Design a protein around this ligand. Structure first.
Ligand SMILES: [Mg+2]
Ligand SMILES: [Zn+2]
Length: 329
C-alpha cells in the first residue's frame, strides 16, 4: 500500500453560498484596472467583475442562467484560500485582465463565439481555484497525494481544472446546463486547454511556439484552433502580467514574495532543501528585474507583435524596470 501524508490542498467545497452585493465597480476594459483597490471598497471584486463581464459579453438570455452564474462565482470564491497572492483577488484580476486583453484585439473579439467567451471567462475565474500557496515542485517534494493523482507537468493546473468542473456540475451552479452535449464538450475542452496553459513550465515553449506563429503571419481568427491558442496566450499574459498595469499596481502584487517566503520557511521547518531565491530578497527591486527581463517583458513584446493594439503593457513594464533599476542603484 502507498503510504502518503494528508494533502495540503483542500477538497472542493460544493456548498451553495449566497452571492455578494454587486454594484458598478470606469471602464472594465481598461488595463489600468486596480483590482486590489476595488477589493478594498466592494464586498467582492471577483463577483462584481464576473457579473459585469457576463453582461458586457451578453452571456445569458434567461434570468435562470444569470442566477446560476452568480451562485457559481460565489462558490468559486468560496474555494480560493486566503493566500497573499493566489487568492480570489488574483482570480478577479486575471478574469478582468483576460476581458481587457480580448476586448482590445478586434480580430479575435469579432470572431469569438459566445461559447468561447463563456469558456474564457470561466477558465480565468477558476484558473487557480483551491491553490494552496505552494508550487508544483513543493507538492512533489512533500509527496502530496495531489502530485500522485495528477501526474506529469502542471499538477495544480490539472487540479484547478478538475475542481472547476466539479463545481460547474452542481445543479445550482450549472449555467451551461442548457448547452447540448456537443457544445458542452467544446466548452470543457477550451477550459481545460486554457487552465492547462497557465502552467509556468510551458512558458518558454509557448513563447517560441507563438513567436513562430507570428513569423508565419499571426493568428487566423476564422480558425477555431487559432482562436483557442490566442485565448490561451492572452489568459497566460493576464495571469503573469499584473506588473504591467502600472507602477502603483505592480507594487501591490509583490505579495507573491510573501508566499515564496512562506514556502521557504515551510521547507525549512520540514527539513527540506530551501528553494533558491524564495527567502525574502534583500532588494525586492533588484530581484524583480530578472523576472521582468526573462518572463514578463518578452511576453508582452510578443503580445504586442501578434496584437498591435495591445501596446500599453510593454510601455508600463519598461517604466517599471527603469524605476526598479534606478532605485536598486
Ligand atoms: Mg496557477
Ligand atoms: Zn494564476
Amino acid at each position: 500500500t502507498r503510504r502518503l501524508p494528508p494533502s495540503i490542498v483542500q477538497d472542493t467545497i460544493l456548498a451553495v453560498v449566497p452571492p455578494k452585493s454587486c454594484a458598478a465597480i470606469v471602464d472594465l476594459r481598461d488595463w489600468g484596472f486596480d483590482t486590489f483597490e476595488v477589493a478594498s471598497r466592494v464586498p467582492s471584486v471577483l463577483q462584481s467583475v464576473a457579473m459585469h463581464v457576463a453582461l458586457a459579453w451578453d452571456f445569458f438570455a434567461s434570468q435562470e442562467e444569470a442566477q446560476k452564474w452568480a451562485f457559481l462565482v460565489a462558490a468559486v470564491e468560496n474555494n480560493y484560500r486566503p493566500n497573499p497572492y493566489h487568492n480570489a483577488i488574483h482570480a478577479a484580476d486575471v478574469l478582468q485582465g483576460t476581458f481587457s486583453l480580448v476586448s482590445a484585439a478586434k480580430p479575435l473579439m469579432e470572431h469569438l463565439t459566445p461559447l468561447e467567451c463563456k469558456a474564457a471567462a470561466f477558465a480565468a475565474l477558476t484558473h487557480d481555484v483551491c491553490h494552496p500557496g505552494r508550487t508544483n515542485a513543493f507538492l512533489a517534494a512533500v509527496q502530496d497525494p495531489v502530485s500522485f493523482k495528477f501526474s506529469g507537468k502542471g499538477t495544480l493546473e490539472q487540479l484547478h481544472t478538475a475542481t472547476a468542473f466539479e463545481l460547474l456540475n452542481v445543479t445550482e451552479f450549472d449555467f451551461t446546463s442548457s448547452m447540448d452535449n456537443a457544445s458542452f464538450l467544446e466548452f470543457k475542452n477550451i477550459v481545460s486547454h486554457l487552465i492547462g496553459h497557465t502552467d509556468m513550465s510551458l512558458h518558454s515553449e509557448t513563447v517560441a511556439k507563438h513567436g513562430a506563429k507570428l513569423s508565419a503571419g499571426g493568428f487566423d481568427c476564422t480558425c477555431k484552433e487559432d482562436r483557442l491558442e490566442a485565448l490561451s496566450l492572452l489568459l497566460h499574459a493576464a495571469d503573469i502580467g499584473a506588473s504591467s498595469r502600472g507602477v502603483a499596481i505592480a507594487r501591490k502584487w509583490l505579495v507573491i514574495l510573501q508566499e515564496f517566503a512562506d514556502q521557504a520557511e515551510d521547507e525549512r521547518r520540514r527539513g527540506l532543501p530551501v528553494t533558491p531565491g524564495f527567502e525574502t530578497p534583500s532588494s525586492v527591486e533588484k530581484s524583480q528585474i530578472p523576472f521582468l527581463d526573462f518572463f514578463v517583458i518578452p511576453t508582452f513584446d510578443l503580445l504586442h507583435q501578434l496584437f498591435p493594439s495591445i501596446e500599453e503593457p510593454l510601455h508600463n513594464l519598461r517604466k517599471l524596470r527603469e524605476l526598479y533599476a534606478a532605485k536598486a542603484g
